[PDB]
Amino acid sequence: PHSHPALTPEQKKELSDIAHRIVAPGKGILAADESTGSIAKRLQSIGTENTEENRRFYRQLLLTADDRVNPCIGGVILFHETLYQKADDGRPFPQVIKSKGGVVGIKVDKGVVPLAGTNGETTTQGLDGLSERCAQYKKDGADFAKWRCVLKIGEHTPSALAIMENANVLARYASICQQNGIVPIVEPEILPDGDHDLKRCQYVTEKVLAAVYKALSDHHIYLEGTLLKPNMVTPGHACTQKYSHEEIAMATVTALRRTVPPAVTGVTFLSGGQSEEEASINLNAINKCPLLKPWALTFSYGRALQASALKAWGGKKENLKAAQEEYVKRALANSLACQGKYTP
Amino acid sequence: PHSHPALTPEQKKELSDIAHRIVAPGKGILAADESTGSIAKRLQSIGTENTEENRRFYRQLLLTADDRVNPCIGGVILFHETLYQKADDGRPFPQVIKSKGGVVGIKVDKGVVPLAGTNGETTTQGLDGLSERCAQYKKDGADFAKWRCVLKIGEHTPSALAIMENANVLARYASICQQNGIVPIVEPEILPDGDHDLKRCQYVTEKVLAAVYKALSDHHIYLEGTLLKPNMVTPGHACTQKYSHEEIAMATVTALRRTVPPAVTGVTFLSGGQSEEEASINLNAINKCPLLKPWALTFSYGRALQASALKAWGGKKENLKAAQEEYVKRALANSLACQGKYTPSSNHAY
Amino acid sequence: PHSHPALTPEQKKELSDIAHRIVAPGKGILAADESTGSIAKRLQSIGTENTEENRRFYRQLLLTADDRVNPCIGGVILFHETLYQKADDGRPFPQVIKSKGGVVGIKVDKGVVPLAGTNGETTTQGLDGLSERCAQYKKDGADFAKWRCVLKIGEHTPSALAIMENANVLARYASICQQNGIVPIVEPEILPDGDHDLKRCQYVTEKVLAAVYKALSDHHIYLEGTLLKPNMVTPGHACTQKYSHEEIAMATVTALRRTVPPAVTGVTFLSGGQSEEEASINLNAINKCPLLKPWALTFSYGRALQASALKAWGGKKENLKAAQEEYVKRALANSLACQGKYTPSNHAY
Amino acid sequence: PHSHPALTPEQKKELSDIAHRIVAPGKGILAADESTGSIAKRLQSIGTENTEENRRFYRQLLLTADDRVNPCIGGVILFHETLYQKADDGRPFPQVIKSKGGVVGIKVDKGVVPLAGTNGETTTQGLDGLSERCAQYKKDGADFAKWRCVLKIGEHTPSALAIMENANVLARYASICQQNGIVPIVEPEILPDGDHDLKRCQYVTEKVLAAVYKALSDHHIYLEGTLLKPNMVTPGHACTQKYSHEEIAMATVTALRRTVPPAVTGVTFLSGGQSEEEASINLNAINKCPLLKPWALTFSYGRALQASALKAWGGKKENLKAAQEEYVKRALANSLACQGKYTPSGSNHAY
Ligand SMILES: O=P(O)(O)C(c1ccc2cc(O)ccc2c1)P(=O)(O)O
Ligand SMILES: O=P(O)(O)C(c1ccc2cc(O)ccc2c1)P(=O)(O)O
Numbered sequence A: 001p002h003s004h005p006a007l008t009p010e011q012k013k014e015l016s017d018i019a020h021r022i023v024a025p026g027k028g029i030l031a032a033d034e035s036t037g038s039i040a041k042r043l044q045s046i047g048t049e050n051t052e053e054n055r056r057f058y059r060q061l062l063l064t065a066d067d068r069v070n071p072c073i074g075g076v077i078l079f080h081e082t083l084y085q086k087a088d089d090g091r092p093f094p095q096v097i098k099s100k101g102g103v104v105g106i107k108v109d110k111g112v113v114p115l116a117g118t119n120g121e122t123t124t125q126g127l128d129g130l131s132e133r134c135a136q137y138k139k140d141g142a143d144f145a146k147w148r149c150v151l152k153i154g155e156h157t158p159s160a161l162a163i164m165e166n167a168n169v170l171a172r173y174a175s176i177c178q179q180n181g182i183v184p185i186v187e188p189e190i191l192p193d194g195d196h197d198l199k200r201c202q203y204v205t206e207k208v209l210a211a212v213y214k215a216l217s218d219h220h221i222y223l224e225g226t227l228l229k230p231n232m233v234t235p236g237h238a239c240t241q242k243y244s245h246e247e248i249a250m251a252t253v254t255a256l257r258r259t260v261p262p263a264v265t266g267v268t269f270l271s272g273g274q275s276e277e278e279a280s281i282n283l284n285a286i287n288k289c290p291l292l293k294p295w296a297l298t299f300s301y302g303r304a305l306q307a308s309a310l311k312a313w314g315g316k317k318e319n320l321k322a323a324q325e326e327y328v329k330r331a332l333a334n335s336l337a338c339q340g341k342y343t344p
Numbered sequence B: 001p002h003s004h005p006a007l008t009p010e011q012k013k014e015l016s017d018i019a020h021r022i023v024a025p026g027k028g029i030l031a032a033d034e035s036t037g038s039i040a041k042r043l044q045s046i047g048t049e050n051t052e053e054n055r056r057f058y059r060q061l062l063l064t065a066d067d068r069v070n071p072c073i074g075g076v077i078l079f080h081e082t083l084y085q086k087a088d089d090g091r092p093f094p095q096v097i098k099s100k101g102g103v104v105g106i107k108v109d110k111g112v113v114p115l116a117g118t119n120g121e122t123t124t125q126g127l128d129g130l131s132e133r134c135a136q137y138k139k140d141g142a143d144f145a146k147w148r149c150v151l152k153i154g155e156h157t158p159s160a161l162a163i164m165e166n167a168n169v170l171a172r173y174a175s176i177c178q179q180n181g182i183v184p185i186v187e188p189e190i191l192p193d194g195d196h197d198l199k200r201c202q203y204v205t206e207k208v209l210a211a212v213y214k215a216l217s218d219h220h221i222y223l224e225g226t227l228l229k230p231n232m233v234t235p236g237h238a239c240t241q242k243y244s245h246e247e248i249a250m251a252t253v254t255a256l257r258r259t260v261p262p263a264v265t266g267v268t269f270l271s272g273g274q275s276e277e278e279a280s281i282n283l284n285a286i287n288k289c290p291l292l293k294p295w296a297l298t299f300s301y302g303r304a305l306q307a308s309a310l311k312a313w314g315g316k317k318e319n320l321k322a323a324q325e326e327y328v329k330r331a332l333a334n335s336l337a338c339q340g341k342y343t344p345s346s347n348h349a350y
Numbered sequence C: 001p002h003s004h005p006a007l008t009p010e011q012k013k014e015l016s017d018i019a020h021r022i023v024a025p026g027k028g029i030l031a032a033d034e035s036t037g038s039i040a041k042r043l044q045s046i047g048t049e050n051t052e053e054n055r056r057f058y059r060q061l062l063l064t065a066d067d068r069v070n071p072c073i074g075g076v077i078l079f080h081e082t083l084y085q086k087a088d089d090g091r092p093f094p095q096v097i098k099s100k101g102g103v104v105g106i107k108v109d110k111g112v113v114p115l116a117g118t119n120g121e122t123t124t125q126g127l128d129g130l131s132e133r134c135a136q137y138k139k140d141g142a143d144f145a146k147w148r149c150v151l152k153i154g155e156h157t158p159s160a161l162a163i164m165e166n167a168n169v170l171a172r173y174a175s176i177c178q179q180n181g182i183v184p185i186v187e188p189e190i191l192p193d194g195d196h197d198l199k200r201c202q203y204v205t206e207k208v209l210a211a212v213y214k215a216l217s218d219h220h221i222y223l224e225g226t227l228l229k230p231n232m233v234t235p236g237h238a239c240t241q242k243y244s245h246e247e248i249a250m251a252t253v254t255a256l257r258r259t260v261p262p263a264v265t266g267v268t269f270l271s272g273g274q275s276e277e278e279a280s281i282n283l284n285a286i287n288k289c290p291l292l293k294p295w296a297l298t299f300s301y302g303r304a305l306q307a308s309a310l311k312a313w314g315g316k317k318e319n320l321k322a323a324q325e326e327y328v329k330r331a332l333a334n335s336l337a338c339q340g341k342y343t344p345s346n347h348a349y
Numbered sequence D: 001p002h003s004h005p006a007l008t009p010e011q012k013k014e015l016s017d018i019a020h021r022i023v024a025p026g027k028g029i030l031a032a033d034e035s036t037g038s039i040a041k042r043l044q045s046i047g048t049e050n051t052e053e054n055r056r057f058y059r060q061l062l063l064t065a066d067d068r069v070n071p072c073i074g075g076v077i078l079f080h081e082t083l084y085q086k087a088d089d090g091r092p093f094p095q096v097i098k099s100k101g102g103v104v105g106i107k108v109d110k111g112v113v114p115l116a117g118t119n120g121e122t123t124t125q126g127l128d129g130l131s132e133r134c135a136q137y138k139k140d141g142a143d144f145a146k147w148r149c150v151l152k153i154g155e156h157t158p159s160a161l162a163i164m165e166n167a168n169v170l171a172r173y174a175s176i177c178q179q180n181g182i183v184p185i186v187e188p189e190i191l192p193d194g195d196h197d198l199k200r201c202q203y204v205t206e207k208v209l210a211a212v213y214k215a216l217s218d219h220h221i222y223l224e225g226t227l228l229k230p231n232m233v234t235p236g237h238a239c240t241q242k243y244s245h246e247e248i249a250m251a252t253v254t255a256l257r258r259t260v261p262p263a264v265t266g267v268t269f270l271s272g273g274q275s276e277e278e279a280s281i282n283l284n285a286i287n288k289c290p291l292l293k294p295w296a297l298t299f300s301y302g303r304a305l306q307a308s309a310l311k312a313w314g315g316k317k318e319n320l321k322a323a324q325e326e327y328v329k330r331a332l333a334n335s336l337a338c339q340g341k342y343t344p345s346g347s348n349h350a351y
């Protein structure tokens, strides 16, 4: 019952200012932090070899798009390798991001691991030496981080253990980040896999998030210096029933209103399995929902910003401009969506 | 991880409609739910005998104040006895309240009891037969309820046990109320007793409220059909340091923003040990605080609405108009305060 | 992290002494604490009218059985009404129990109530004014109490909420009891209803008991001054897979060994739906189980001590002795069973 | 509310057999798992250079003691480095341990880290890639592991957060170990630092252990395949009041009886700040305590087995037998203590 402040007022101000820059009006996050094993599949899908150069080039493609994205992109999440790579003009990618008015983010988790005694549930690892890494990332231009936990809706999942453990590791990660001047993005993703309906997803999302913010409270996390990256509330991929974008928006905003304290600076939705357009329309519906929403509601999109660019590129240097144009298309669409002004 | 809905959509709409009516803009709650043993202290302090009639008359005095209070009072909390009493003209008090545009509330807890193994901490009892009582109260005109838990800031308090137990009993009470169409007011009062400073109170309040809303989630409570009745964040009574109303306001709004989900319909502050004027000024500062507040921020005042009326009355029938006038003045002041329009005459430091 | 002792050494000794008397070797508990609504069903089943007199008479029948039961019965749980009734010789029943060497117990809970938002799960009420009632019961001869929580094995039950809520109310009840010199019997009964198998019951029992004793710890309960009244670990009533009494015993003792601190003075099993004989055989197997058991393992039986006596009585005054003889028969059987003296792959668990 | 078994019957049997071998009657654990940075302090204190060779030689000194220790030592905990070092005859140290009838253990945690928002409290790290490490250690001869959490008794500590977090990380570590056939030693150490009295330590130990075993339950840990390594219940170092060994034993055994399920195979006490002799006397008092104790009560001693041997050695090879002799002497003393048979010649409700 005694306060031993985790953060000084100066530390708090820094975190809050960073968090606010990332989700400033009209702005969202480009998620380009695919691990080498994850980006491999994407290159493979356009018949491109998974080399450091192709990864460097593709990231350059995204990060060096014209200045039309500048007001659309408040932050860019990088994977470790990309943080220390350079553009053709010799500029480190973090410098490229900052020069276009963006904040640099770093994915810091080390993937999921199985929870014994559960039906295929996982927790996430990556806490070991995390404090030193965060200090180093901070020096090298990073101001926020990402940590992904994954939960599954099934007959017996997500279990009490899975919810409790994932909420706890998220809280530990968030605590270490804030000690090093890094804004943590808390990502408790509930997968869309399954035949569950919308209100089951809403129920699970509400329970997961209540657990998350209790955990953050127990660990003395400064919410104004954090962001939330949740799934939208949607039916499962195999659900036959159909819902309008307004119903999805209503269920999403409702779940958040019942669990997310106003002090949280912003919510940066993941797109999950949604198409580029679907992701933009839902985000727009969410921002048009008439209920009171005391946090920024924007995007942290990977696929939903990149899918078309990757295809237009096709691994061919000459299609650079064509590819970039597709990315700018989505960045502009989503900058409008997070203001509720997007009309396809 | 499977939903067995506690409430149907219609039950939800009813609770939500009630909750919103109580804290509509400019409106707050008159807390007149003092137990017979509690009102005894009030009457004795003005040299008046504690009889059922004097209790009936005093409550009548408040409930029949002129129509200037109508837009000020969205709800009135009554103690059991008063719910079944009548005004001089034969009208049941609940009818008196409703005809003036108010919602009728009922205090349903049965007081604090000691928690063994703690430094003088308590939980609250009153769950036994609560469902039957609530159904009966609902039938008899009550639409919301009050349940008071008490926590104290000390060297080793509030303990983990006290916080967990009180949050859990509050959630049980809220669940039972909502099954019977009653809106529960959740009151986790942190007493002002002690020499703690403002930021100690803010810390404890944040921890208490986080535990409260985790418990409400675990018990499947419909937040849109609830109200919160917390202490304002203030220094302890014995704290020598001094604070402005703006700091009190900032600390209060900050604690709430960090713990109370937007879905909560409203926050109805208790006045605690504050004077009538102090309570109004603080509530006004809270509503002027520039930070974003996604819930109604209003009052659930007992002493802060009644203190002057009670004194002007003095147990004498002939002081009716003078006494009622004091009550109306405070009702008017607080209706302005809960809109941030009352006149008595940002920082990451929190 | 600071101690504010709930009990003095003297209070502790009293509670511990009581707990040990109740479960002394060879002894168990007669559960005669059926509420008026529950005993109604039994009287009805033998075509007897549910009157205060028939209830008084039936209870008298059990409490005044001959001295062969004295070493068998360490405790008798009564319902409120019975606590204040008298035998034909004018003696209050508590005095009748004590004179036969028994400890007097009182059921203090006020029944189950539904938990909203769950699939038919309940918690238990009865905390209001419980401290005053306990103080009064203590004056009137009661030295221990009973509080029954009920949990159900289903597709989505027992839920996290149900386990947490029932464990917490049990802890509150135990705390209040110990403040008033009453030994609380903690009964988190997991019902046998359903077609679940033995290891599901063992799993649920292990999880419930872990929750119970964490709760008891959080509420500063003095375990040496408590008793546990759990279900035995058995398959569901409708389970098609068959088990031996040795497997039931192994699963039961394993579950307890994994959850029940040694400091707990005794385990007094409820018989549930088991027959009189089945209850005795299982209890005997439990005590024969070769694993180490650091608590007394005995009985708190209602049906398993009374079923035959009730039928033999049949509501006829003249059948008193015949009825009593049936009860004595079961008391003797279970007194042997709780010593492992009754004759009618450990890692697989 | 549905079981998805973490372990098969065969996995359970393996873990149980290992746990039982380690704490068989008369046996305890030699804790020789001091990290390179921790062992540095011990060598410096005897004016010896902290080199890999000197560390190898010193560990060799302990592990190759004569066969009088064989019935005394059920297990030996090694630090990573030592697990892959060899004796002079080319034998890997794990084989030396096994040939003397001992089980091989490995410390797998990566030290404490600060918990933000607390008064100097910590949790422990080391879970990352722990499964892979455990699989490798198993392959390389290790059958059990050690993970140390540290809690401190102060005015506002151990806090709820500290207790919960450390209990939870211990449960994660135990879960991963058991998936890889490794018996986890659960060590929730409450430091003796401070001026608190005996009953404060007993109170805190009881609360910590209750949290530990709830956490282990939540994470589906197989208790029969675990060991507990707790502090004894003692007053703080700076406590002015004095207590007998009988009182220390009573408080220690009482705390365990109130929290540790019978299914736990054994309790291997840490000696903490105790002298070699004090550690043996207390352990002996614990085993003579008349209360019922349904688990093995033995030792997992570092300093209390090594202190005298290390000084007698002084870093000089010619003092080998003398140094070993001091180690053997403590091993024999503690083998007797964990049977309640140790002699220097060789109210219950108050708690
Ligand atoms: O065909 P692909 O390359 O897998 C493509 C896709 C899928 C996931 C992606 C994830 C990313 O983070 C970035 C780009 C992606 C692109 P989609 O599945 O949307 O067609
Ligand atoms: O003379 P008292 O009884 O102390 C008076 C007082 C105190 C507490 C009160 C509490 C109430 O709920 C209603 C009226 C009160 C009136 P105050 O302290 O405000 O003068």
Ligand SMILES: O=P(O)(O)C(c1ccc2cc(O)ccc2c1)P(=O)(O)O
Binding pocket: C034, C041, C042, C043, C045, C302, C303, C306, C307, C310
């Ligand atoms: O015919 P009944 O009343 O159901 C009879 C019975 C059943 C439950 C009983 C429960 C008791 O607590 C005491 C006596 C009982 C007696 P049984 O079913 O065992 O024959």
Ligand SMILES: O=P(O)(O)C(c1ccc2cc(O)ccc2c1)P(=O)(O)O
Binding pocket: D031, D034, D041, D042, D043, D045, D302, D303, D306, D307, D310
């Ligand atoms: O002089 P040192 O090296 O500090 C010695 C000591 C202290 C702690 C020790 C801890 C160990 O794990 C193994 C040996 C130790 C030896 P002590 O303090 O007992 O004399």
